[PDB]
Amino acid sequence: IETVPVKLKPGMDGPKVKQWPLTEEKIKALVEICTEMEKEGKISKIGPENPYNTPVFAIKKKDSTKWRKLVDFRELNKRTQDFWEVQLGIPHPAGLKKKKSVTVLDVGDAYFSVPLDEDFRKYTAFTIPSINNETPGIRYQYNVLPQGWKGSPAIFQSSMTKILEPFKKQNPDIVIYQYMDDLYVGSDLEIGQHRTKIEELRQHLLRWGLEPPFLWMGYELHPDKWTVQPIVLPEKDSWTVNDIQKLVGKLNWASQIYPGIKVRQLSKLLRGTKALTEVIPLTEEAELELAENREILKEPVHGVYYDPSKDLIAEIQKQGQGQWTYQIYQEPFKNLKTGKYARMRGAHTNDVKQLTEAVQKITTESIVIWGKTPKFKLPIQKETWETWWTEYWQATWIPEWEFVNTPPLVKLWYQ
Amino acid sequence: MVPISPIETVPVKLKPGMDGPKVKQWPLTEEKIKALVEICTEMEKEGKISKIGPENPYNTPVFAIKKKDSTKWRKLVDFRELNKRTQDFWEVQLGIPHPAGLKKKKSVTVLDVGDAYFSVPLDEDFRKYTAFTIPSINNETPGIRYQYNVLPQGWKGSPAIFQSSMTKILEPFAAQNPDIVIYQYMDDLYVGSDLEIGQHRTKIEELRQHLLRWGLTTPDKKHQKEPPFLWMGYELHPDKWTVQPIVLPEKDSWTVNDIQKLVGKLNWASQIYPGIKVRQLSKLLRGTKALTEVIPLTEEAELELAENREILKEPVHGVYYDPSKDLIAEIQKQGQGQWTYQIYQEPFKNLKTGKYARMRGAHTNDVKQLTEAVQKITTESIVIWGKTPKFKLPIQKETWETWWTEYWQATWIPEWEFVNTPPLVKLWYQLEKEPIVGAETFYVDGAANRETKLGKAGYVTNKGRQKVVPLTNTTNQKTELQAIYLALQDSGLEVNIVTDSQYALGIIQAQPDKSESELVNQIIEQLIKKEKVYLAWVPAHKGIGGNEQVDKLVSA
Lengths: 415, 556
Ligand SMILES: Cc1cc(/C=C/C#N)cc(C)c1Nc1ccnc(Nc2ccc(C#N)cc2)n1
Ligand SMILES: Cc1c(CO)cnn1-c1ccc(F)cc1
Ligand SMILES: Cc1c(CO)cnn1-c1ccc(F)cc1
Ligand SMILES: [Mg+2]
What we know:
The complex is a heterodimer.
Chain A: H1 24-39, E1 43-45, E2 56-59, E3 68-71, H2 74-79, E4 101-106, E5 126-128, E6 138-142, H3 151-170, E7 175-179, E8 182-187, H4 191-209, E9 219-221, E10 239-240, H5 241-254, H6 264-267, E11 279-280, H7 284-296, E12 313-320, E13 323-329, E14 335-341, H8 351-370, E15 375-378, H9 382-392, E16 400-403, H10 411-414
Parallel strand pairs in A: 12-15, 15-16
Antiparallel strand pairs in A: 1-6, 2-3, 4-8, 4-9, 5-6, 7-8, 10-11, 12-13, 13-14
Helix pairs in contact in A: 8-9
Chain B: H1 30-45, E1 49-51, E2 62-66, E3 73-77, H2 80-85, E4 107-112, H3 114-118, E5 132-134, E6 144-148, H4 158-175, E7 180-185, E8 188-193, H5 197-211, E9 229-231, E10 234-236, E11 241-243, E12 254-255, H6 256-269, H7 279-282, E13 294-295, H8 299-311, E14 328-335, E15 338-346, E16 349-357, E17 363-364, H9 366-385, E18 390-393, H10 397-406, E19 416-418, E20 441-448, E21 455-461, E22 466-471, H11 476-490, E23 494-499, H12 502-509, E24 514-515, H13 518-529, E25 532-537, H14 547-555
Parallel strand pairs in B: 14-18, 18-19, 20-23, 23-25
Antiparallel strand pairs in B: 1-6, 2-3, 4-8, 5-6, 7-8, 9-10, 10-11, 12-13, 14-15, 15-16, 17-24, 20-21, 21-22
């Protein structure tokens, strides 16, 4: 009810980010949403003395027909002061990734109940463009904590902890973790029980609220089943020259991750200049080397540790037939997590939809495990990604990304 | 009197840390001073400026300029210094409407709102920064000191504040009259509708009555401007549009600057004249920017210029957008990285046209370029019409399918259909996924010395075929490609090739069909002639047979 003072970082001006082109249907949806938000006092029209801007668009959350305004506050979030005044931080709960069921709630509508510092509001400015720029873009700023801004969970955090106290005291084994506009709620209960507790939780916020348009939804995750991708070598009775070449290449690559990998005795099998399809019998020495390599590869990688002061990096490879592999790391060759997807939903003829869904699933895993989003290295041309990703986006946050333009040789080894 | 609503002032600040201008007034002749004093006396009577005391420490210089072929002087207050110190504003006019997104209108009327410009007050707290001084006759008295009460012409904030003030006034009229459109440009309002002319003129008088609620008068004697309108390089008519006349000069010899102007005209023309080309003319502007230098036109540029003159021989017009019909975009390959497109709704009636040029890069292919052109047209179409057109593309469905399923990147093109108008985009080669049984295996390598640039490239095969070639002025990377080329040249129609060159694999896995490197181009031409090629990579220096042998032959 009273505003928390908020500043940008020293020597740092507000965002001035161009609005990208919006479709007719997203413009109409935003006009309708913003007319209502303005009537409810959440946003107000601004004049030309405000030169700041952040892009806006609109999405449909997973499994619903109603539009959700999404403001891309990535630049504002970079430029906003860090929030360590009351707490140095919310030490990320390491138990969340061990629960059998984790449900994700959109609680962002709660933020609209807290006014935003009068002197900071100018920096939340956004524009609803018009088709063909035929009428001036509609200019607004926020009067209340916005969805998507990193300050909102921080400023609302004292109110959230109070709202949730009776639920936590009654359910002490439940892990509740807040990331931006999401609440993550993990339990080890039978899913029918689980769903009921989640509905219990919603009521605490409905009760306090007295409506949230997307609070009723539930994205269910089962992180205890999440799968990883160790390095595995083929088991064959007949090895061709080509097979052994590919094995030596994969082992050479692995030797940068794992020290004691040896290829000497496997190379020796190719002595001469042989046809690629010719079958080569493994000698005993080569078989032993190969078994010793198999054994090395069953052990964890040495010296792998998470540092919360460093970015997480996520790399993705397209493997074909709807399959995608990925790795998350901070230092080269020190993977914190690897994985593979194939269940790309409703995208069997659309690579770019499949990649957008992969980015979202990886980001979710990163939030659950470390409590922040990775920086993505995406195998796509920038112009293709930028034209299409917002058509498939269903999350209320947005990570950072860069583009890979040269084909990585390592795609072969994650196959 | 009739009460009028005031126009709300926009609060205005100087940039953080800056103070207002304190700029010396230049000396003026007795004649100019007399003229400025009369001009300013009238401006003061009209409320635009006010006399101020000597406490105000700011100043901006004032000038008198003789309006040519007239005995009447005009005043110029030079706000360049205040403008550097004034905050930035939101600029609404950055994106201008494209005529091809406009709707046909039966009537468009123009209303002059220049007098309204002066009803727009300047923020009271900012006025002091606009002070100026008329020098006195013979500098024997204090100069006359004035400041502005209204938005000054030439001040940084005037266009944005004027436009934002007028938009706010007009918003309720536009909302409660959805059967008209209103657009402001300079000191005019343009009002369009599809109404019978009597209702249209009724709307116009209602707009005039609405504007009177702020005391804004518009001239009774109706505007002289009437369709067609010359606007932002275009000619707008009620039911069609075009660009203003494109006139390519005749010239015996061309300068850098001339060629830049020529390309500018051709680029402007290309939004409605189909098929304009500028590659060979732009190639003449490579690197150099000595605006007076004469460049000989190549034979290729002469042909391009000649082809463009033909395209421009007679007027072409676009039609306006009908939101009830699909948008269709058709693309043609023109050669040399150039693509052209037309967007239409009814056959043979273009809304607009355009072109796309290949990005600068070492290697490329036609499928990638077509994809890029599709993404550019999509983005432009979202801007102009808010939706993606349906595409008509010169590439077979089966070719696209093969491309995107095997390409290492994610890629996508929205809803499209094949149009069989040559030249078609095709896949020139496609490497095997598995080694070929019965095909000879070539183990290739090359090496060079970084100092003498002397190198060797070669191969050995499982049939005992061998070749090593000594090379001069070469590099490790070049010799690795040179070795692959030799294997392609000396093999039959099916071949397995084993390389340790990560550089060469990176290039070939990008699937180029054209390259800035004549060596890559030679390799592409050999690949096109083969029936089957399998390319295998191995790590260097690991005792791998075949690779080890040829590495030794070429590094000797
Ligand atoms: C952008 C714009 C520039 C001018 C005028 C600029 C100037 N000078 C005049 C108008 C009215 C508009 N606004 C719109 C909006 C939607 N359809 C149209 N169609 C439209 C406009 C002019 C003519 C004509 N003749 C025909 C159709 N104009
Ligand atoms: C989504 C986006 C961004 C942000 O990545 C930049 N441009 N665009 C974009 C590109 C093409 C469009 F048609 C619409 C929007
Ligand atoms: C009319 C024309 C041409 C034809 O040569 C080239 N640029 N322009 C142009 C385009 C936009 C303008 F605002 C003014 C001029
Ligand atoms: Mg070598």
